[PDB]
Amino acid sequence: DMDSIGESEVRALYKAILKFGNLKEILDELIADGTLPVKSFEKYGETYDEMMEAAKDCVHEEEKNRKVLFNFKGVKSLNAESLLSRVEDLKY
DNA sequence: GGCCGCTCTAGAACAGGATGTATATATCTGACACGTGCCTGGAGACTAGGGAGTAATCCCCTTGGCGGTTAAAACGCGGGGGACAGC
């Protein structure tokens, strides 16, 4: 199962990173406290990085548009700007 | 020095998650039927001896009749006891 990701896990990850930024430090605790259902740590890591890159791409698409929700694996429960800002702000 | 734009706050709408309940769908459970394979019993064939069947004769038993006598059965009558209904 560890290579799959469920929409409930997409939700839980999205909320987690909305609260905590680069979860991959904490992420073991976030599984151990049950915030995230059990999955491969590597899979959560890569799908996090993937959506960070997709958020950057969304910002490039905004730049293309002028010169906000976007899906993960079709799951619409995601937006770029909140995550990107929250992650960098909480890191700082 | 003035006005408009930008930012923040407030209200409204929509969606998702959480929880409980109902309904539909799937799975199990069981028995019957059919198919397959193997083994055993039945079927077929042949012979010899014994049992059954057939025939005759004789003897004993059973059936039928007669007569008389005796006991049993049938008819009769009255009274008592038991059975039946009630409470």
Curated annotation (Swiss-Prot):
Coiled coil: none
Record localization: Nucleus
KO phenotype (gene knockout): Decreased sensitivity to the cytotoxic effects of 6-azauracil.
Family statement: Belongs to the SNF2/RAD54 helicase family.
Complex formation: Component of the 1.8 MDa SAGA complex, which consists of at least of TRA1, CHD1, SPT7, TAF5, ADA3, SGF73, SPT20/ADA5, SPT8, TAF12, TAF6, HFI1/ADA1, UBP8, GCN5, ADA2, SPT3, SGF29, TAF10, TAF9, SGF11 and SUS1. TAF5, TAF6, TAF9, TAF19, TAF12 and ADA1 seem to be present in 2 copies. SAGA is built of 5 distinct domains with specialized functions. Domain I (containing TRA1) probably represents the activator interaction surface.
Written domain comment of the UniProt record: The 2 chromodomains are involved in the binding to the histone H3 methyllysine at position 4 (H3K4me3). The CHD1 helical C-terminal domain (CHCT) binds DNA and nucleosomes.
Additional facts recorded: Present with 1620 molecules/cell in log phase SD medium.
Function: ATP-dependent chromatin-remodeling factor which functions as substrate recognition component of the transcription regulatory histone acetylation (HAT) complexes SAGA and SLIK. It recognizes H3K4me. SAGA is involved in RNA polymerase II-dependent transcriptional regulation of approximately 10% of yeast genes. At the promoters, SAGA is required for recruitment of the basal transcription machinery.
Protein name from the UniProt record: Chromo domain-containing protein 1
Native organism taxonomy: Eukaryota, Fungi, Dikarya, Ascomycota, Saccharomycotina
